[PDB]
Write a protein that binds this ligand. Sequence first.
Ligand SMILES: *[C@@H]1O[C@H](CO)[C@@H](O[C@@H]2O[C@H](CO)[C@@H](O[C@@H]3O[C@H](CO)[C@@H](O)[C@H](O)[C@@H]3O)[C@H](O)[C@H]2NC(C)=O)[C@H](O)[C@H]1NC(C)=O
Ligand SMILES: *[C@@H]1O[C@H](CO)[C@@H](O[C@@H]2O[C@H](CO)[C@@H](O)[C@H](O)[C@H]2NC(C)=O)[C@H](O)[C@H]1NC(C)=O
Ligand SMILES: *[C@@H]1O[C@H](CO)[C@@H](O[C@@H]2O[C@H](CO)[C@@H](O)[C@H](O)[C@H]2NC(C)=O)[C@H](O)[C@H]1NC(C)=O
Ligand SMILES: *[C@@H]1O[C@H](CO)[C@@H](O[C@@H]2O[C@H](CO)[C@@H](O)[C@H](O)[C@H]2NC(C)=O)[C@H](O)[C@H]1NC(C)=O
Ligand code: NAG
Ligand code: NAG
Ligand code: NAG
Ligand code: NAG
Ligand code: NAG
Ligand code: NAG
Ligand code: NAG
Ligand code: NAG
Lengths: 728, 728
Amino acid sequence: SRRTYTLTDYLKSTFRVKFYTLQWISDHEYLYKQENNILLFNAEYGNSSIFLENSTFDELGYSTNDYSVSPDRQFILFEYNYVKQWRHSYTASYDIYDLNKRQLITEERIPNNTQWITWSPVGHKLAYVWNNDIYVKNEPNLSSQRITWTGKENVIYNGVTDWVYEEEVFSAYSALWWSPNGTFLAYAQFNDTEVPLIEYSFYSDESLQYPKTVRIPYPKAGAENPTVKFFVVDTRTLSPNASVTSYQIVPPASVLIGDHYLCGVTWVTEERISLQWIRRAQNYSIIDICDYDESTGRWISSVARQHIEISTTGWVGRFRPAEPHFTSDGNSFYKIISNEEGYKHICHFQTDKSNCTFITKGAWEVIGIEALTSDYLYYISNEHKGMPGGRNLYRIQLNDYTKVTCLSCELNPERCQYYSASFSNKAKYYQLRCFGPGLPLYTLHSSSSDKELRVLEDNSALDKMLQDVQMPSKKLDVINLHGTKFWYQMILPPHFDKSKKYPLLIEVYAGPCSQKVDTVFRLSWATYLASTENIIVASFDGRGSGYQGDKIMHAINRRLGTFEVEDQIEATRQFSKMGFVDDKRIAIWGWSYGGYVTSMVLGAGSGVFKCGIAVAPVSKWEYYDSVYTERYMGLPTPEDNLDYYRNSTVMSRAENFKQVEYLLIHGTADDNVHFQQSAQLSKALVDAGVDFQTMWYTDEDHGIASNMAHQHIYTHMSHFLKQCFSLP
Amino acid sequence: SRRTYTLTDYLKSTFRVKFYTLQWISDHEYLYKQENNILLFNAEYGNSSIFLENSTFDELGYSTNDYSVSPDRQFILFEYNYVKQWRHSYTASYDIYDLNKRQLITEERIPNNTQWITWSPVGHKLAYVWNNDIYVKNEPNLSSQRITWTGKENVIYNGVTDWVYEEEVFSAYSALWWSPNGTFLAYAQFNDTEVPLIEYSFYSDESLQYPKTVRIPYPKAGAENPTVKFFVVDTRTLSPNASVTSYQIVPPASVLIGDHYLCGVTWVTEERISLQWIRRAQNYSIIDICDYDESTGRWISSVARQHIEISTTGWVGRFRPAEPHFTSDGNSFYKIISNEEGYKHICHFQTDKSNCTFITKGAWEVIGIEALTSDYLYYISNEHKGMPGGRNLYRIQLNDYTKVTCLSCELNPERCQYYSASFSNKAKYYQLRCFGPGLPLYTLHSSSSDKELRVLEDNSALDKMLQDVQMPSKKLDVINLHGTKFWYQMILPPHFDKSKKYPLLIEVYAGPCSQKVDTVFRLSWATYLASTENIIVASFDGRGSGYQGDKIMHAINRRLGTFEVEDQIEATRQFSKMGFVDDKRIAIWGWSYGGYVTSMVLGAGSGVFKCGIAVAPVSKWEYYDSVYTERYMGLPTPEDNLDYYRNSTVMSRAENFKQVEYLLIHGTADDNVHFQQSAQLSKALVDAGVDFQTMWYTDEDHGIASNMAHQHIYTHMSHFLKQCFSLP
Ligand SMILES: *[C@@H]1O[C@H](CO)[C@@H](O[C@@H]2O[C@H](CO)[C@@H](O[C@@H]3O[C@H](CO)[C@@H](O)[C@H](O)[C@@H]3O)[C@H](O)[C@H]2NC(C)=O)[C@H](O)[C@H]1NC(C)=O
Ligand SMILES: *[C@@H]1O[C@H](CO)[C@@H](O[C@@H]2O[C@H](CO)[C@@H](O)[C@H](O)[C@H]2NC(C)=O)[C@H](O)[C@H]1NC(C)=O
Ligand SMILES: *[C@@H]1O[C@H](CO)[C@@H](O[C@@H]2O[C@H](CO)[C@@H](O)[C@H](O)[C@H]2NC(C)=O)[C@H](O)[C@H]1NC(C)=O
Ligand SMILES: *[C@@H]1O[C@H](CO)[C@@H](O[C@@H]2O[C@H](CO)[C@@H](O)[C@H](O)[C@H]2NC(C)=O)[C@H](O)[C@H]1NC(C)=O
Ligand SMILES: *[C@@H]1O[C@H](CO)[C@@H](O)[C@H](O)[C@H]1NC(C)=O
Ligand SMILES: *[C@@H]1O[C@H](CO)[C@@H](O)[C@H](O)[C@H]1NC(C)=O
Ligand SMILES: *[C@@H]1O[C@H](CO)[C@@H](O)[C@H](O)[C@H]1NC(C)=O
Ligand SMILES: *[C@@H]1O[C@H](CO)[C@@H](O)[C@H](O)[C@H]1NC(C)=O
Ligand SMILES: *[C@@H]1O[C@H](CO)[C@@H](O)[C@H](O)[C@H]1NC(C)=O
Ligand SMILES: *[C@@H]1O[C@H](CO)[C@@H](O)[C@H](O)[C@H]1NC(C)=O
Ligand SMILES: *[C@@H]1O[C@H](CO)[C@@H](O)[C@H](O)[C@H]1NC(C)=O
Ligand SMILES: *[C@@H]1O[C@H](CO)[C@@H](O)[C@H](O)[C@H]1NC(C)=O
């Protein structure tokens, strides 16, 4: 050791962090890909048997990037020819392989350019989306039956989301939900007819003589939104000479009354489905539990089965309302909602009663419900040690809320404080995934006695490599702001010399319900900055941040660009007091919402920051999408919140940029935060006579994620920072 | 002490160079705007009188952008609501003011958004284009008569040029030509139905929620071109219930056979018109002189009145074939063409004979023919002192070509070496316009005696201001490359000390027929760089440059990006050996073709240049327009010149940029050299792992000309240069 973690190490991922991905297929069995082949591991004993030999991969077309085995284990889908679209959406080609006959299905194949495909929950039916229309295949070798005929590029989407539902509502491209036993196929249809189009140039390969213009129906704040229709198809009658039997379920009257969004769909039993709707304002949601009427095929709703959730001080949920988790019988459900104290906790609801009963409580929050059995409820929370940036698995007895045990807290306390879990079909077994503060660790456990069972991946290899590099140390702590304790973290350079003044880089996100301070282990750009360049990188979660109750999260309601920006400045000011920080060399950077906050901070005229870098920042809320923007800002009209939309633009702070060195970066093909945002920001700075630097990235999107652009952007930002900090 | 010429001096135009713009309206009178009053000057005796008092402008109620007086002096057109389109095109509102009854015409007004308007050459008829159609108004107070009905946005243009004809052929938006006595109105119709559209985003004011997509029919190299039709309208028959009497004149068969361009229109007499056409290849042009047949109304062509001009070593003319200058009777004409030695000289042609006689000859070139009488021909050439970068007015006796006199050469030999001239009707008087090397000097002269009559503007005001500043000096000289002498200029810092080593900035354009080395006086960014920052700024005209004969100019025929780039490197190499050049600090910069050459030089890997700045550069010829590109490069097909198109891209040299500091600048709304060119170049540099700097300019066009962007770009470039040269 006498070498550090370099920029090249980060960019080339020279130090590999291993993981362990598996797919549960029963209550005690899971599939795992080891050396290209799919093995069938038995959780209980660990006796692994080959389920699908490697080499059986004849590089069909390209390379199989994913597989899915039908529930009855008779077939397996091979996904290849992956073509990305937005954040979650993509199209791909699919091959169906018969596990019995061990033959490739060669007739009635899945179309090229398939948008979404899924096996039914039992058996082996298939439902897929192609050219915006839904198709169902009862048997892999049999021809598919067309379900919808209205699909139309950029207009009508059946079974898949449009741009805004994908990014802001579902966080998924799929909008198809098979019923438990495959009798019914539920789907949503999105109509973007009246949604304005964002248009931008895409240059493509150097050989393309004329650039292409990309057009996407994208509703900006206050614009016309897509409309949605939810249908339940009875697949029993699907036949070439038969029409489709379907029923449209509409939201309850209190939501149907105005613009709204469908935000959740949960099958309860084969004859009961739970739909969660939310008004466009997003401070009023309702769960509607509909029952199938065997005599008419209708799905009936009743006021007794409706559950309302509202927020008078903000929006419902973290990014959307939490999903209900029903009991096997469907007579009750558990769901995370805000406490009387503003903390998100699990409440128990009777399907036909309006009052619920909280089963957890405290100045901490449940992150999510992971599994439910007739006797226990497993959930993730940040209760342990009172640190909101930590995560642990817990089990609570359904007939005695006094009985709650933490399953992961003590397994490896110093190496593991941030966990996620994956349960087998009947919660009989669960994989624990520890992400930090130590090297990631994957383990298998049995719910019986919570026995450690075995280690799946401990990253021993990475550990060996790292003991030879001067790694920086990551510390978390708290600071007081306006009478409130907030968390921060600092990545400190190795062989830290307290007698020296180190330049400081604040990495910020700060969007509503964000969390930049946690105990997750990361080999990041910051690791390089601290290890090789001796720069301290700090992050702070202030007002508007999440997992600490609504009082803190809702503080920025209807006022984005205010308290979260001010808190970054105030916190940095506190950090600057430390004798080991060179207060004359403090920078700030961020991506997306973080680019916005970085810019707002730099335009605050605080005198605290010397320079900063904003990557793909929002610059004006009217330019961002309706769903996200309106959830936090209401509408941009004088009758509502136009005044706060107007004085929260970065452009309104243009003059103050004369005091700092600024680097504005943006991908020209960003379909999310449009290049427009940075183009308008640069124009305002030019108008104000302010000098600054820019870097556009041709054809890169919101992630500036291509291999060469990824390397180029961090290399460019690194040079900008060294220049700002007078570092050789 | 003494203040230097600062960046702010340049940016704010603190030092104002005055001029004297007049409009000849007869053989001895000219209008001149003075203190916003239009004055009428008599050259015969120097006396003047008020033509229009400025009180009139006060009464209009809008900012008058320009005015145009009818030839019979009874009316004046007032242009307002000016909205720029491309380099020459724009739209505007117009009022007609009756000078007799001194009242504004309020009836049958000219439509707003008018695209072009012009008085007839005699009287006061008006012809104008609105919504791509032509209208004629015999009287200011009378209703106009529509002439064409095919006008269609982005498809059919009547009376005005489409994008490429405006920029590359006519260097004007107008495509209408009244006959000498107003009998006929000729116009061209352009059809862009099959021309591909370039599309790019325009962001507009910050309040525009969604960007707009600008679309322009623009033929890039090898693409489908606009087609053209030429018509002569007989305006004597225009009447509300009369059809339009017109005749279409088609090109001669040697041009009609394939794609071609109309490149010139010259009215000879009321019954004779000269049309100049060129094949799409641009090395074959033909003049077709058509005569009006009074018995049928048609315009007749004859092989006897056709004159062919070709080029076997390159293209025809400098940027277009030179225009013919006809005698008053139309029986012969004078036109500049390349002679047997490859130098452009004046040839005398008989309208109905094929052979011509050269009246000028020598190792220098005639720039243009300025005026012609029955006895003399006046022209501008760079014959004096054999310096290609100088310009003087000569007069040649038509009956004895050996009798040639230089009218401007000895007027002010040290102050004035570069002149342009403007002759009155019948060439009785001329204004001489001296542009350098000293301060601009405008004088008036009598042709009968060649007496100087008077000084119109001598810039005494500016001269004074400049004595208190440390102005740099501009030196011109020659060097030998490959055995050919070429010219260069150096702008030298004040108190230039032969001993001291200075950083060097090469300012380059170097496109075909360019001339960056001349004796013109200029207050430029270079002036500031020399005066204040002590940087030597040099320019060099190498192979491909103009005004030095075809051997030099056509050297880069079919090979753009080769010799002109190599010559800039070689010249600079020689400069760095002059002892007063700090070879550790040599930079190069340019705009448009200059940005392309700057990039190619930086990508050459010569180790000569430390850094460079390309502004709105061409990066790949297939991205530029057909007319310009094909003129010098032919077609991008394997059958023609694809190979030289392929290895002349800036992207092909990306790897070599790792050795230099580069700044790429481009306006996002550049309709000429599309932003695409820099977007594809940056993408190739990113792919090659090259770090560099960028600066986009939102909504700026090829000129990056808005007041704020102009100040911003030079400020940004100065900082970059100073950082490259370690200048505080
Ligand atoms: C309308 O026209 C009248 C002329 O009848 C203009 O008046 C003239 O205005 C100019 C501009 O300021 C005056 O010139 C000045 O002369 C002094 C020389 O002592 C010089 O130092 C200044 O730089 C400038 O050149 C001129 O004396 C004056 N003439 C008269 C007759 O008063 C008037 O400006 C015009 N109005 C508008 C609003 O354009
Ligand atoms: C998608 O939504 C649009 C409305 O935005 C629907 O268009 C309407 O269709 C009805 C019936 O054909 C017409 O009477 C209206 O005039 C249409 N309105 C507009 C603005 O076009 C369209 O039918 C919907 N498509 C689907 C399949 O649901
Ligand atoms: C937009 O304007 C509001 C109202 O002027 C700003 O809120 C004030 O911020 C100051 C801090 O300078 C506080 O002292 C006041 O208490 C705030 N008043 C209100 C009504 O909350 C807000 O900060 C501005 N937003 C931005 C982005 O600058
Ligand atoms: C494109 O390739 C051609 C052919 O190789 C280049 O032309 C040669 O240029 C070199 C360097 O000046 C000379 O030594 C050869 O005599 C040239 N050969 C020919 C066939 O002309 C040309 O320079 C290249 N163009 C660019 C911009 O790199
Ligand atoms: C297939 O598995 C064997 C071990 O059973 C392994 O050695 C081989 O590399 C695998 N094939 C690959 C690399 O896909
Ligand atoms: C594991 O071994 C048991 C016998 O102990 C056998 O029945 C089972 O099928 C095996 N499963 C796997 C996946 O190896
Ligand atoms: C369905 O229609 C097709 C039409 O070609 C027919 O061949 C088939 O027999 C029909 N289904 C039955 C068997 O009723
Ligand atoms: C929800 O927000 C809207 C503003 O868009 C407001 O009119 C309404 O009163 C809010 N409702 C609640 C429950 O706060
Ligand atoms: C100049 O004087 C002549 C007479 O010598 C006269 O006709 C003419 O109109 C005058 N011009 C002006 C503008 O004063
Ligand atoms: C323009 O050209 C198109 C073919 O490119 C032709 O069909 C059309 O008739 C022409 N229009 C006119 C008005 O000449
Ligand atoms: C032209 O015809 C119209 C009738 O359509 C009539 O009003 C007008 O008087 C006519 N003008 C002429 C030139 O006779
Ligand atoms: C004009 O150019 C064409 C195509 O580039 C070529 O075939 C022809 O030889 C040229 N004509 C002359 C006289 O050079």
